[PDB]
Amino acid sequence: NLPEHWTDMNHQLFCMVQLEPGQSEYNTIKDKFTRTCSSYAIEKIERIQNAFLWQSYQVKKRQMDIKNDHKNNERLLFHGTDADSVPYVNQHGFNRSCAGKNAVSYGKGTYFAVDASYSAKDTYSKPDSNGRKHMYVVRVLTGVFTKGRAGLVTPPPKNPHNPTDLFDSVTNNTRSPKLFVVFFDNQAYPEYLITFTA
Amino acid sequence: LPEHWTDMNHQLFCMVQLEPGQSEYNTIKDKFTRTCSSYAIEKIERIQNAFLWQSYQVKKRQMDIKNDHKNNERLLFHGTDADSVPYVNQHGFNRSCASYGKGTYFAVDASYSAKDTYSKPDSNGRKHMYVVRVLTGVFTKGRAGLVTPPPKNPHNPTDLFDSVTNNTRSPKLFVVFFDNQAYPEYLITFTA
Numbered sequence: 001n002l003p004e005h006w007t008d009m010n011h012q013l014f015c016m017v018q019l020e021p022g023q024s025e026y027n028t029i030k031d032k033f034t035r036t037c038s039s040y041a042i043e044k045i046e047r048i049q050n051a052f053l054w055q056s057y058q059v060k061k062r063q064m065d066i067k068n069d070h071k072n073n074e075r076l077l078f079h080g081t082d083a084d085s086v087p088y089v090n091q092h093g094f095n096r097s098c099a100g101k102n103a104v105s106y107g108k109g110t111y112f113a114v115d116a117s118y119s120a121k122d123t124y125s126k127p128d129s130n131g132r133k134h135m136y137v138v139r140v141l142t143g144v145f146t147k148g149r150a151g152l153v154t155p156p157p158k159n160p161h162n163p164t165d166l167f168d169s170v171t172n173n174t175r176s177p178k179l180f181v182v183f184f185d186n187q188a189y190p191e192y193l194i195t196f197t198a
Numbered sequence: 199l200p201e202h203w204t205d206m207n208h209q210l211f212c213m214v215q216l217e218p219g220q221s222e223y224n225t226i227k228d229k230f231t232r233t234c235s236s237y238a239i240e241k242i243e244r245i246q247n248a249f250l251w252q253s254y255q256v257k258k259r260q261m262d263i264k265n266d267h268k269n270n271e272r273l274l275f276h277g278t279d280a281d282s283v284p285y286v287n288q289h290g291f292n293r294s295c296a297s298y299g300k301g302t303y304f305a306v307d308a309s310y311s312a313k314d315t316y317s318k319p320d321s322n323g324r325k326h327m328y329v330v331r332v333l334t335g336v337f338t339k340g341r342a343g344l345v346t347p348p349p350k351n352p353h354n355p356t357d358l359f360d361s362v363t364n365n366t367r368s369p370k371l372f373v374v375f376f377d378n379q380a381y382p383e384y385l386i387t388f389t390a
């Protein structure tokens with residue numbers, strides 16, 4: 001049941017759609033990026049249309065919407081990546097088994113930044129052999145969250161006497177969240193890919 | 199939500215103890231006793247987890263569409279220790295807890311899962327294994343260190359097998375690498 005602003009893909013399941021700088025769609029992403037990354041320059045922004053990831057992600061959104069009490073369950077966040085991971089992410093999304101350590105670790109899952117500046121660090125968005133850096137703009141199901149800790153393999157339980165009722169994600173700091181970690185597949189939809197440069 | 203599930207009173211999760219001697223129980227007990235006739239069954243419970251089921255069915259449909267006329271689903275076993283039972287009931291099998299890859303492992307034969315290393319006897323001597331619907335799909339031989347299955351063709355590196363196995367001609371185990379590929383359908387509590 002695919003979004004109606006999507007390009008018609010003609011029975012195909014995957015497509016990257018190049019956005020056009022006049023569009024509000026392009027400019028809102030650009031502005032979100034330049035909020036913290038004004039020193040960097042955008043080459044192109046591509047919309048990612050992946051039917052299967054979209055469908056699995058939306059089911060999990062519905063479930064989290066049901067389980068949580070009228071919460072705002074989804075945030076739009078950034079993830080820097082190397083060029084070599086781009087084909088995999090476009091197709092298969094974010095895999096906790098493939099994630100690198102963060103400089104500051106709040107668990108073993110996939111990290112998503114509030115600020116594009118964070119993701120824009122050479123450590124996360126490594127320059128390809130042409131100087132191009134790569135960052136995804138992601139819908140992430142952050143749900144209800146707590147401060148994480150380095151050893152986490154899943155989010156911690158809300159209550160220790162009920163170990164299976166879990167927070168949806170973890171953050172560095174619940175007062176001022178700058179990162180969120182997710183620990184399950186299809187909890188994050190890669191919506192746009194920003195190609196950018198110095 | 200499948201028909202043989204019994205009414206949930208608008209709940210999204212429950213465990214339903216099966217009635218011995220009726221068809222559902224006999225079908226699952228037969229699968230088990232095929233290889234573990236020396237073990238005693240204490241009870242079998244049907245796991246009715248609406249959220250896991252929904253995500254599993256989504257993936258089953260996608261794989262049915264993606265694969266050329268394949269039988270993508272198998273019934274397999276998984277031994278678990280007692281302390282992991284509430285987690286699995288609620289959230290399934292997680293590769294991040296857990297020789298042929300860093301995924302979750304499912305046995306063809308209940309005998310494999312009956313091993314104490316997999317279905318660790320609790321304090322009462324009670325062992326636990328699941329009967330599991332697994333999206334095995336198109337599979338290939340696994341090997342250590344895999345974090346996803348290999349690509350079907352090394353020239354389309356993102357087009358992946360669905361699962362791996364120890365032996366493709368005669369598989370005794372399957373390894374899946376994602377969260378929506380294994381539904382815990384029944385829990386068998388039993389003794390040696």
Ligand SMILES: [Cl-]
Nearest residue numbers: 276277311316
């Ligand atoms: Cl097992």
Ligand code: NA
Nearest residue numbers: 065066068070
């Ligand atoms: Na709700």
Ligand code: NA
Nearest residue numbers: 262263265267
């Ligand atoms: Na098909």
